[PDB]
Amino acid sequence: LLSLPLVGSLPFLPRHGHMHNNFFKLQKKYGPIYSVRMGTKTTVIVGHHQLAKEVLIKKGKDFSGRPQMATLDIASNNRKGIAFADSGAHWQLHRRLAMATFALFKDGDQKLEKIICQEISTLCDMLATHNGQSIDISFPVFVAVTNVISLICFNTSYKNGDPELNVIQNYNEGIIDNLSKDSLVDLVPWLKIFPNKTLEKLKSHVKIRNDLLNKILENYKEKFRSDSITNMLDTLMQAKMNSDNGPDQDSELLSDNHILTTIGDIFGAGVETTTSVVKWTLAFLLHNPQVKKKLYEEIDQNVGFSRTPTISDRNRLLLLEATIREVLRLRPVAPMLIPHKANVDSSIGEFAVDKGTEVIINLWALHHNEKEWHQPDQFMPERFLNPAGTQLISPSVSYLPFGAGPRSCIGEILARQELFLIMAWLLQRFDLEVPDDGQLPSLEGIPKVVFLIDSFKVKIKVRQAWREAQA
Numbered sequence: 001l002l003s004l005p006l007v008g009s010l011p012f013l014p015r016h017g018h019m020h021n022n023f024f025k026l027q028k029k030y031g032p033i034y035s036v037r038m039g040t041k042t043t044v045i046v047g048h049h050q051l052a053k054e055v056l057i058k059k060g061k062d063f064s065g066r067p068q069m070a071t072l073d074i075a076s077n078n079r080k081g082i083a084f085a086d087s088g089a090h091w092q093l094h095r096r097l098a099m100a101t102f103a104l105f106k107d108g109d110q111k112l113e114k115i116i117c118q119e120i121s122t123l124c125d126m127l128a129t130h131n132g133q134s135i136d137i138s139f140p141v142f143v144a145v146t147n148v149i150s151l152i153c154f155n156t157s158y159k160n161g162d163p164e165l166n167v168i169q170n171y172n173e174g175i176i177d178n179l180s181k182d183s184l185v186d187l188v189p190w191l192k193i194f195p196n197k198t199l200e201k202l203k204s205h206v207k208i209r210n211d212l213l214n215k216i217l218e219n220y221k222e223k224f225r226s227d228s229i230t231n232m233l234d235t236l237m238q239a240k241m242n243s244d245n246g247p248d249q250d251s252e253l254l255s256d257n258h259i260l261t262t263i264g265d266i267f268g269a270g271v272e273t274t275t276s277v278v279k280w281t282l283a284f285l286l287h288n289p290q291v292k293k294k295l296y297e298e299i300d301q302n303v304g305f306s307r308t309p310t311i312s313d314r315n316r317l318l319l320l321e322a323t324i325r326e327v328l329r330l331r332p333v334a335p336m337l338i339p340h341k342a343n344v345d346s347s348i349g350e351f352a353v354d355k356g357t358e359v360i361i362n363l364w365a366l367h368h369n370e371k372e373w374h375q376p377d378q379f380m381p382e383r384f385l386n387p388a389g390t391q392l393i394s395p396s397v398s399y400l401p402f403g404a405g406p407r408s409c410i411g412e413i414l415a416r417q418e419l420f421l422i423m424a425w426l427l428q429r430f431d432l433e434v435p436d437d438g439q440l441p442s443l444e445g446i447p448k449v450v451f452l453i454d455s456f457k458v459k460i461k462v463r464q465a466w467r468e469a470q471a
């Protein structure tokens with residue numbers, strides 16, 4: 001009796017469980033590196049640190065490409081900007097220029113710590129008004145980090161109540177929603193198989209994103225001055241200026257649409273990533289009062305109430321620094337990073353990988369590898385401290401919250417500063433507790449282009465100790 005012709009085979013059910021976890025689980029059958037073919041496209045998935053470091057660092061430039069996706073084309077205005085731009089002159093220029101911009105913010109009025117703290121100060125005054133109430137803290141945090149990224153990009157901020165903030169939240173949620181159903185990694189290309197309105201809806205939100213950023217950049221052409229380079233748009237316009245002095249080869253690279261998309265990548269990631277990690281952290285603290293208590297003891301013992309926290313306090317608030325590390329481990333913002341692509345014929349783990357092959361680093365697998373981590377599925381900030389609680393250790397080499405190599409995160413410094421000061425200022429002022437109905441946040445998460453957490457509410461109360469210290 002005969003066996004059936006097989007025209008197709010997938011290792012696991014699509015749209016069942018988080019992709020990143022399905023790939024991980026599948027290593028128990030197939031090892032830390034395996035591929036899948038979808039028509040002509042081949043994708044390689046890699047779930048061990050050594051192989052990952054090879055893809056990101058040792059052979060970084062071989063695999064520094066980005067695959068093309070119909071969805072990422074719309075958000076990137078056809079692979080302009082930085083994150084979804086393929087390897088090439090454009091990407092290199094803008095990545096470098098965006099990196100150069102952050103370097104500015106080391107000193108003076110536009111020192112990064114002082115910018116963040118001004119916005120955190122507002123946030124906390126605002127949250128304090130909700131004393132005794134249970135709220136979703138998303139929008140307040142969104143506002144705070146949006147003003148920061150706006151300052152970095154434009155040296156402008158939004159006034160309290162500016163309806164533009166709401167317009168931005170709307171299109172951000174709309175784009176993230178339609179950019180991918182779940183993660184960026186789709187085994188089956190569902191959107192090209194059945195009738196649907198995904199690209200239409202995505203274009204609509206991006207169009208509002210673009211029109212908005214266009215007015216800002218239009219208006220700023222009147223304000224640009226070559227003797228005043230203090231933000232990212234300055235930096236970018238200076239480059240276009242210097243290029244056109246017949247025009248340089250960088251001239252094509254810096255059209256207004258190029259500048260716009262890069263600003264968009266930076267504006268989008270400056271809000272969505274950090275707002276998200278803040279929510280995750282609070283979520284984990286609601287689930288672990290014992291950790292949360294010790295963060296209060298720590299921040300009262302090393303900072304007290306004479307003054308507000310400072311970047312300098314990273315020295316003493318070690319458990320807080322450890323807590324942040326652990327969230328970035330347990331719930332990485334990008335658990336499969338952003339997809340990479342083989343720029344040339346190369347190899348991983350001595351296996352052949354052809355030009356154009358998509359390569360995906362399963363960061364989730366690295367952070368949950370049993371042989372590299374003690375009880376990986378547990379929230380344990382202590383793992384990032386020595387047993388004495390006196391300083392910060394790196395307990396595993398299988399840890400890359402911010403990527404590495406040519407495509408590593410360019411916003412890490414900003415991220416780490418925002419994350420640490422937001423959590424420090426909040427913990428100094430507020431008791432952050434479970435709402436009156438007793439609902440805890442689901443820690444499962446919602447994987448999109450970023451690893452989001454479901455909306456949830458936190459009962460916020462002004463601390464006794466903070467109050468008593470106002471005299």
Ligand code: HEM
Pocket residue numbers: 082083084095265266267269270271273274277328332333334337338339401402403404406407408409410411412414415
């Ligand atoms: C909690 C905060 C953040 C985390 C954990 C994080 C982590 C990451 C990761 C894992 C990647 C992918 C690396 C790869 O594809 O190989 C990435 C890329 C990137 N990040 Fe972030 N990031 C964070 C915040 C930010 C912020 C605040 C910015 C602000 C500008 C930013 C800008 C970017 C950009 C532009 C890329 C694309 C790099 C490229 O394609 O060259 N990120 N980040």
Ligand SMILES: C[C@]12CC[C@@H](O)C[C@@H]1CC[C@@H]1[C@@H]2CC[C@]2(C)C(c3cccnc3)=CC[C@@H]12
Pocket residue numbers: 075083084171172173175176179264265266267268269272273333334409449450
């Ligand atoms: C999709 C978007 C959010 C909504 C809107 O603003 C449009 C933007 C367009 C750019 C996107 C952005 C989402 C985070 C991204 C993908 C990101 C990132 C991700 C995870 C960790 N570090 C950086 C680099 C580019 C960023």
